[PDB]
């Protein structure tokens, strides 16, 4: 039966750095790209939608535009990996990766963000 798994369910990252969080799913030697759907979101903001083997940019959230991409190279290994550059305090929260490949499943990932005072203060008046 179809199942998504996470190697890690918690990431602790530094304000200003780059992050890759991952969802694994089974591919039996070889990917059928036509049938694959990958959707990632955080608190109901869309981050990427990979359908018919291509990213759809239209429905991506503001926060994420050209900061967030799916590492397409990994897909044939059964790895939907999300890369986000220049982490902000507001990137902290619970992420879900939703995968349709025959079956469907999803998983959740918690992101914590450490930040120095000047950064936390700017966010404190948001």
Site of interaction with ligand A1IXH (CB under 6 A): 37, 39, 46, 49, 51, 59, 98-100, 104-107
Q: Which does 121 bind (CB under 5 to 8 A by kind): ligand A1IXH, its own copies, none?
A: none
Residue 97 and residue 42 in contact, taking contact as beta carbons nearer than 8 Å: no
Q: Rule CB under 8 A: say whether 45 interacts with its own copies.
A: no
DSSP category for residue 93: E
Q: Judged by CB, which is closer to ligand A1IXH: 15, or 40?
A: 40
CB of 40 to its own copies, least distance (A): 13
Longest Cα–Cα distance of the chain, Å, equals: 50
Structure tokens, 92: 């902290």
By CB under 8 A, name the one of 55, 106, 114, 119 that touches its own copies. 106
With CA atoms as reference, report the closest residue to 41 among 21, 14, 11, 18.
21
CB of 104 to its own copies, least distance (A): 4
Q: What's the burial of 44, exposed, middle or buried (CB within 10 Å: 0-12/13-18/19+)?
A: exposed
Q: Which residues bind to its own copies, rule: CB under 8 A?
A: 37, 39, 44, 51, 98, 100, 103-104, 106, 108
């Amino acid at each position: 039966a179809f199942t998504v798994t996470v190697p890690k369910d918690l990431y602790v990252v530094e304000y200003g750095s780059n992050m890759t969080i991952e969802c694994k799913f089974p591919v039996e030697k070889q990917l059928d790209l036509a049938a694959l759907i990958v959707y990632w979101e955080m608190e109901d903001k869309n981050i990427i939608q990979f359908v018919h083997g291509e990213e759809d940019l239209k429905v991506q959230h503001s926060s994420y535009r050209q900061r967030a991409r799916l590492l397409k190279d990994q897909l044939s290994l059964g790895n939907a990996a999300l890369q986000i550059t220049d982490v902000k305090l507001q990137d902290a929260g619970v992420y879900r990766c939703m995968i349709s490949y025959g079956g469907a499943d999803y998983k959740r990932i918690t992101v914590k963000v450490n930040a120095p005072y000047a950064a936390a203060l700017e966010h404190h008046h948001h």
